[PDB]
Structures are given as C-alpha cells and as structure tokens.
C-alpha cells in the first residue's frame, strides 16, 4: 500500500499519454512535434511496466520508478511546449508522476 | 467514454491478476496449480493490451476485448477452484471483466 | 518447434513495424497517413504479445495468432498504399506474418 | 546498426527467460525457487521493452539498457543456482545480455 499513490498516478499518466498520442495522431496540420508522439509512446510503455512492477512487488521497483521519473520528466518538458489542451493535461500528469516517482525512489 | 467502465474493470482485473501472481509465488507448499500462474500472467498481459487499445481508440478494440473476455473467462474458471482469498478476488474480478467485455463487444 | 517459423516471422514483423514507426515519425511533410502510425504501433504490440504467447506455450496461442493475423493484414493493407521503402518492407513483413499466422491457427 | 548485436542478444535472452518460465511452471516438486519465476518474468518484460526501445531509436536507449543489464545480472545470478538445463541456458543468455548491455551503455 506504500506505492498505491504512485500506482494511481502512473495509471493516470498512462491514460494521459495515450490520450495525447491519439489526439496528436488525429490532428494533421501542426505535425505535433513528432518527438512528442515518440515520447508519449515510450512514457506510456515505461509507465505500464512501472505499474506492472509495482503491482507485482518486484525487487527492481525503485530502478524502474527512477527510469519512469526520468522519462516522465522528459515527456512533460516536451509536451508542455504545445498549445493543445490534451498536451497540457499530458504534461501535468507527467510532472505529477515524475515528482511522485522521485519522492518514492530513494 | 463508452468504454471507460470496461477500462476501469480491466485495470481492476490487471491489479487482481498481478496480486494473485505475487501471492501465488510467495506461498510454497500448495504449488498453486501452476496453470493459475501462467493464466494470471497471460490475463494481466492481455488486459494491459486491452487497456492500451481502449485508451488509444484503436480500430481493433472489439477483437482485443473479445480475446480478453475469453482469457478472463478461463482465468476466472481456473482461479475459482482455489481456497485462497486472493485467488477468489482474482476470479471475481476476472468474471466481472469477462462479462463487461462480452457486453461491450458485439 | 512447431511455431518457431511463426516466432521468427513475428519478430521480423515487430522489427519492420518499429522501423516504419520511427521512419514515419522522422519525416514531416507527408504526415504519413497517421493511421499507418497507429496501426504500426498496435501491430508491433500484438506481435510482441504473440511472440510472448508462442514462446511461453500459452493455451491461448491460436486466438492471439488469429488476432495478430487480422491486425497484420490490416497493417499491411494500410502500409502498402505508401511510396516509402520502409513502408513497403513493413507491408511485406506484415503480409508474411499474416499468412504465417493464418496457416498456423486452424 | 550499432545496437543490432544487443537487439539479437536481448531477443535470445527473451526466448531463454520465457523458456525457463514455462519449464519452471511445468515441473512441480522442486518449487524452482519462485524468485526465479518472478525474475524471469521481469527480465523478459524489461528485455522486450529494451528491444522495443532499441528498435524504435528512443532517446532513452542507454537508461533502459542499463536497467536491463542490472535485471539480467540479477536473473542470471539467481538462475545459475539451479541444476536444470533450461535454467543454466537462461543464466548464460542473461549474462551474455548483461555484458552486452554494459558494454553498450556508457
């Protein structure tokens, strides 16, 4: 139960990254800074792995959470440069998951 | 929003399958009917893929949800034969996710 | 060993779909028919799950392989409409994996 | 092409970890030191993510490869304590993938 807050934060960050992925693929004219798409995919995959590792009580919980913190920091810093509302929600959820994973792993 | 109930049910089924995986790996003397472990892993992986496909609005949402319904039916039918409380919770969450995916895909 | 040809074909299809994903994200002016990007991601994920299910001898091998056949048929039919060489390689690997999964599952 | 050797080594390590998972779940009387099963699952999942990140040319290639090196070192050190041939093959593939990921990331 000591990682449940980080589990719920990473599930919300998964949902925000997948929503930003889909709503960036729907729009066409901006090109949405395609590193945002690649980073949203890699952030959703590392957050899915972090949820899987925290829910299974793995002995590599802190290292996966530190890597997820780094990827979430980069995904938030790249998605915050956009004007769309889904990208701002993705950046806010990524920074929340990043500060949660940095406060978790020590 | 028309698949959000199935998304939350599959996230609860992911958590229940991973918890049954970990608590079946912790105990030693029963051997916990190792098909339960393999089916809990495959059910958690197909439910993670189903959550990823429903959150990304994929064109193959119904087929992944029907496969997730079949795997959740089998995982519930195999985990319901056990006396442990985590296995009964896993079976109840798997049957809830199974009836949700069967009511969803049509 | 009776699914090893399908395992190697799905690994080659994973590599081709990820390469088409990356080389579609690199180019900017075409927009690369963003359904190609979404289908390449979903095809790489279902082929990773199919490789995981065939390598673990799961009881749901044929259903995952039939779903992988459907997704590979759709990804090949959508990537074959493009002029880029990586998209043509992705379409050829997807149709090879599709005919291998359709000849496998029966 | 500068990570293709690590990609093939991680694919062989995925196959060895999944084979050790399945052949540890088949046998019953040893109990196969269930941390071996959990570590084989987590090693196969981090190696699948490392293959996905190296095949997609992600900007977080070195960090995922260093985490995969740590998990492969631990999985090899835990699987080398067993007498079964699949566990020894899993340990040899894990140490090969570990030295490849440690020679790769710098």
From Swiss-Prot, chains A, B, C, D:
Species of provenance? Bacillus subtilis (strain 168)
In this UniProt entry, which cysteines form S-S bonds? none
Which gene specifies this protein's sequence? yhjQ
List the protein's name.
Uncharacterized cysteine-rich protein YhjQ
What InterPro entries does the record tag this protein with?
DUF326, YHJQ-like
